Design a protein around this ligand. Structure first.
Ligand SMILES: Nc1ncnc2c1ncn2[C@@H]1O[C@H](COP(=O)(O)OP(=O)(O)OP(=O)(O)O)[C@@H](O)[C@H]1O
Ligand SMILES: [Mg+2]
Lengths: 73, 393, 48
């Protein structure tokens, strides 16, 4: 299932190419990186912490969760 | 043939005459000079052999592709039959008036450069909806309306006949006419008549025929119906039994009624919306009209609204003599005796009486129809009334 | 007509998908500059 390039007539694989994804999938990717700080949302102060701890914390400090011996959410 | 517009007052005047005399005189000078040249030299040989050069440029195995996007600049993207997409150059001899996306274009074999176009079928829907001449009859077979027929003639026929009247004063004709009244009273017939008598392409549709069993097909049908009506010059549309599609629009409803409302919105936009409707008229019929949507029958959508009463005393005599017209009757036919009764008879009821009497006359082998047969048939037809007698009265 | 799907490496090398014909890994003729071509834009290529 890999993606390789072949000679046009001898049909001999000649190089490895990046995997193929449907263009629709690729368009879903972020490029602009919006700019809205955690100050712009007020009144949801518990929820913001919940989500930040759930999603971002594991990605940076994975050592904590490994130490407690818990899989993160 | 792509002649100049006088754009004088456009109404019989001296300026319309002088701009008109001028074009005639120039055409006269041109014709004289052309005839002189043709006598001086046929040019048939020169005009020929240009066909030969063209046919040389377009090789024998010309390929029928399918244009898909004109870059607006004598280039195109033409798709071969298999499905490939090429980017070819449009040559100089193709009549560009005939180039629109989706047209079957005629490409070169080795170079696929566009070198012609072809005609297409004329029956997306044109055949299925157009009614041609009405087999029933012309305006002769309709009697008793007089005023209503006059209204329709002024609404739909007169703006085609003599545009000067409306044009002189700066007022456009009414938009649409809605025919409303008790069942069996002459709506569909009058539409048929004004169709078979006028000179446009008249299209007919039943409302229940816009209730489609796939989502988003009713709106497509209405959009097409109003799409092949500007392709065809002046045109008329008559959506009969509209009640089945346009209803009061009660919101507390579930099911396919939402699709009905959505097609109604599409129609409501087509009749009077963002764009200009071009040259088309809309007639409609509804036995029950109190139940239509206010936005469908509002002034700018349907200006004229026509009531259709039953025959009263004498139109009954007229209709009877219209349908009994072609049948040998005995000399004892007390027609008035059948008409005098105030039985609230309807026009379709009169036709039913005529046919039933004729049929039993056939049953009894008798070469002629007798009054006794007509009265018996009348009793038999009225037998289809029913209901609760004391109740309500 | 061909639909570019990827532009790999800084060096021009373009994977295009000709509709219903084939899928190739081709380069830029001299007329087009590298900035003009992006991923996902229809492009025209020659028959040789
Ligand atoms: N004044 C009339 N002159 C001639 N025929 C008439 C007249 N009134 C009714 N009819 C007859 O009525 C028959 C029914 O057709 P018609 O077009 O009149 O129906 P309609 O009024 O549109 O009916 P519906 O309300 O059900 O749509 C016609 O065949 C015609 O024979
Ligand atoms: Mg009717």
């Amino acid at each position: 299932g890999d993606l390789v390039g072949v000679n046009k007539d001898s049909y001999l694989i000649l190089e490895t190419l990046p995997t193929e994804y449907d263009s629709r999938v690729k368009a879903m990717e972020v490029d602009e990186r919006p700019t809205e700080q955690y100050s712009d949302i007020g009144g949801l102060d518990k929820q913001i912490q919940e989500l930040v701890e759930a999603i971002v914390l594991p990605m940076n400090h994975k050592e904590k969760f490994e130490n407690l011996g818990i899989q993160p959410p | 043939a792509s002649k100049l517009p006088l754009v004088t007052p456009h109404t019989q005047c001296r300026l319309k005459l002088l701009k008109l005399e001028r074009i005639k005189d120039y055409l006269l000078m041109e014709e004289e000079f052309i005839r002189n040249q043709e006598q001086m030299k046929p040019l048939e040989e020169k005009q020929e052999e240009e066909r030969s050069k063209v046919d040389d440029l377009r090789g024998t195995p010309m390929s029928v592709g399918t244009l898909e996007e004109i870059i607006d600049d004598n280039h195109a993207i033409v798709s071969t039959s298999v499905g490939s997409e090429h980017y070819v150059s449009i040559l100089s001899f193709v009549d560009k008036d005939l180039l629109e996306p989706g047209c079957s274009v005629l490409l070169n074999h080795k170079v696929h450069a566009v070198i012609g176009v072809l005609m297409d079928d004329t029956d997306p829907l044109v055949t299925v909806m157009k009614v041609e001449k009405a087999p029933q009859e012309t305006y002769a077979d309709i009697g008793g309306l007089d005023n209503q027929i006059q209204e329709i003639k002024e609404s739909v026929e007169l703006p085609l006949t003599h545009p000067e009247y409306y044009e002189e004063m700066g007022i456009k004709p009414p938009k649409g006419v809605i025919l409303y009244g008790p069942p069996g009273t002459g709506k569909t017939l009058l539409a048929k008549a004004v169709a078979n008598q006028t000179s446009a392409t008249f299209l007919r549709v039943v409302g229940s025929e816009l209730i489609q069993k796939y989502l988003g097909d009713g709106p497509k049908l209405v959009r097409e119906l109003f799409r092949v009506a500007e392709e065809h010059a002046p045109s008329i549309v008559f959506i009969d039994e509209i009640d089945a599609i346009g209803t009061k629009r009660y919101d507390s409803n579930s099911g396919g009624e939402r699709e009905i409302q959505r097609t109604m919105l599409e129609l409501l936009n087509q009749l009077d919306g963002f764009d200009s409707r071009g040259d088309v008229k809309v007639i409609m019929a509804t036995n029950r009209i109190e139940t239509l949507d206010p936005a469908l029958i509002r002034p700018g959508r349907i200006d004229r609204k026509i009531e259709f009463p039953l025959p009263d005393e004498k139109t009954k005599k007229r209709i009877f003599q219209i349908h009994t017209s072609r049948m040998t009757l005995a000399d004892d036919v007390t027609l008035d005796d059948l008409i005098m009764a105030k039985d609230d008879l309807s026009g379709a009821d009169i036709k039913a009486i005529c046919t039933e009497a004729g049929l039993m006359a056939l049953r009894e082998r008798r070469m002629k129809v007798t009054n006794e047969d007509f009265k018996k048939s009348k009793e038999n037809v009225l037998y289809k009334k029913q209901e609760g007698t004391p109740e309500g009265l | 007509c061909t639909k570019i799907i990827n532009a790999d490496s800084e060096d021009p090398k373009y994977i295009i998908n000709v509709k219903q014909f084939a899928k190739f890994v081709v380069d830029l003729s001299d007329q087009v500059a590298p900035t003009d071509i992006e991923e996902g834009m229809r492009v025209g290529v020659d028959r040789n």
